[PDB]
Design a protein around this ligand. Sequence first.
Ligand SMILES: Nc1ncnc2c1ncn2[C@@H]1O[C@H](COP(=O)(O)OP(=O)(O)OP(=O)(O)O)[C@@H](O)[C@H]1O
Ligand SMILES: Nc1ncnc2c1ncn2[C@@H]1O[C@H](COP(=O)(O)OP(=O)(O)O)[C@@H](O)[C@H]1O
Lengths: 511, 79, 79
Amino acid sequence: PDWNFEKMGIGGLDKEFSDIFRRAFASRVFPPEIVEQMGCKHVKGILLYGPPGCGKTLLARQIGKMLNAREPKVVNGPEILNKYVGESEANIRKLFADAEEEQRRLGANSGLHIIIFDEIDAICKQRGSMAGSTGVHDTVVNQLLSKIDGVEQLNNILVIGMTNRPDLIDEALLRPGRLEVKMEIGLPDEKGRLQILHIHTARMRGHQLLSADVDIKELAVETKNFSGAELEGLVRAAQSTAMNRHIIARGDFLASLENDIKPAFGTNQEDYASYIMNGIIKWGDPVTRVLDDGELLVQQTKNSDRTPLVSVLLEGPPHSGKTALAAKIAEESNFPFIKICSPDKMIGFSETAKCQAMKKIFDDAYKSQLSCVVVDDIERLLDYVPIGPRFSNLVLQALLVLLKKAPPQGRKLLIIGTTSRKDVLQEMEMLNAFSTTIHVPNIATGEQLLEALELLGNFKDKERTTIAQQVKGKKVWIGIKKLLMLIEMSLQMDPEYRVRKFLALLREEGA
Amino acid sequence: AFSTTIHVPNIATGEQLLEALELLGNFKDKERTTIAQQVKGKKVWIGIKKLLMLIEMSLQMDPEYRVRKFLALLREEGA
Amino acid sequence: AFSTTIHVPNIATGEQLLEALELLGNFKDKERTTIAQQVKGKKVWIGIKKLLMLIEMSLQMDPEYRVRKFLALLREEGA
Ligand SMILES: Nc1ncnc2c1ncn2[C@@H]1O[C@H](COP(=O)(O)OP(=O)(O)OP(=O)(O)O)[C@@H](O)[C@H]1O
Ligand SMILES: Nc1ncnc2c1ncn2[C@@H]1O[C@H](COP(=O)(O)OP(=O)(O)O)[C@@H](O)[C@H]1O
């Protein structure tokens, strides 16, 4: 048995490699004298899927190193497509034909010619047969499988499939014998990451550049979700500070410093700022009780085995910063995975491009254990307008099934809408699908207003005395983003005229 | 085009509802009995998949306020 | 554009019904005496392609509740 992971190359996924070893590759490592009776033909092909950056391509070559081929030829799918019809399929034919010579020449004792596809998922779209929608590339796959399971079948081969979209592949491409067996890779647990860190450090520890104040046990777990690929870049970044340390003139952690730089596959901390200008200004009880409620039912999820999915939307009148509150609710529990979906970046897209950004985000999210995702300004991406009813049916349809779509077993998430008007939604039947709602009343009163202004501190006691004298009495109904807007508009004034400008403008709010 | 149809009734009855709690065991005898005093001679029309979210959302709470918000959020739906 | 039409009628009479059942032979005369006394004087609008579902869907029950369900189902459509 040659399958031990004390060999350094990869780690953390030990069970999955064990499995392929268990049922996939046992035939090829066993004394053949027995099986030569049984005539058991080997797996010709295998599939493994998972997130992109989790070190799958070093598995394949490692089994090639483990059980020696001449060498791998690795290819990328898009590296072969041609406008000219003949060329693309022919390339594949060359790849296979390299082996057939040895197989027929040297019979059935030949060594493996191994193949790897970096991503199939474009080429292996599931063709379907009818007069229309035959397909664009539906004829390359025929040549492929005809090589795999075809006439003059060969036992001289091994082929590795790779994808991040396992469901689009045709079911016959992967029927048993052509590729029988599938494995899932999922983003590694902290144990796998401490192994990986042991790996990439193993030279540094030996060369003793980094001798001190370095613990992988904490430094692994402080990140709950990363890809093993980024960590090597991280280690390279960790290597960069010692070289950026000698710009001034034997190694230090800069990891705690640099982790803020890195966009993860998972959570990001640097996207708040555009959404959070000012932080969370608590003007009164409703604000704090709301985000307290957020902190309340988040625990529901994290402590629930029977409700993986939960959902709310923060409704309220406009310009109350519901977006910001949702962002804070995300930021409050230090989740593994948080992400924004917003029209800001999906701008100027068709009804089926933004959908494919959205399915991308959630199926990206499904495979994390615990997550919080947020969608802002539902009305906008739904492309709602009152004059005419107009919207894209596609979007809400594909959205609400996701609100009713449970992720795979053992993974849980909550989802957050910021919709500012729900009458449409009640009419449009998204509101029965959401579990529950939050009214976010905008500030209704001056006694709360001046309090907030004291928290900001723009205005003096006299400037504030002005307000306190004139109106205690009105109930002003105002969204706060507008408040900030016009104080900044009055903050520029002749000081004597500063305040009553604010007041006069403020009395134009309506209702 | 469809041959026949079958109406799944939603759960009208408090007793029937109470039996499910009795079945699931999310709630203890003391509170369930408190509900029995509270809700009987009563018709309640709420969804099952709604119920799950209710009992759990309350089941994460401190016990004193737990049931109180439960039936409050339940009575949020009259019919 | 159509040169002519044909109205196809739908089964109007327990008479046509029960003789159709004489034809199929699924139900024998004894139970049909009951169904006779049930249909006479009343009108029926149902087409047979739906009937031929009702026949077997009732058939799969035990014989005693057989015909009572059959007609009791047909109450819905006949009304
Ligand atoms: N606790 C708070 N109360 C009120 N406003 C806050 C609070 N915390 C932050 N904000 C402010 O909310 C503003 C965000 O704007 P806002 O999200 O209200 O526009 P919007 O509501 O998305 O627009 P629309 O009303 O069309 O949805 C920021 O300036 C932010 O500082
Ligand atoms: N144990 C491991 N787990 C995850 N990733 C690893 C591990 N060991 C190495 N890696 C990194 O995983 C990366 C995989 O990159 P590659 O396979 O080229 O892109 P993709 O993973 O998207 O196909 C490699 O660059 C490698 O540095």
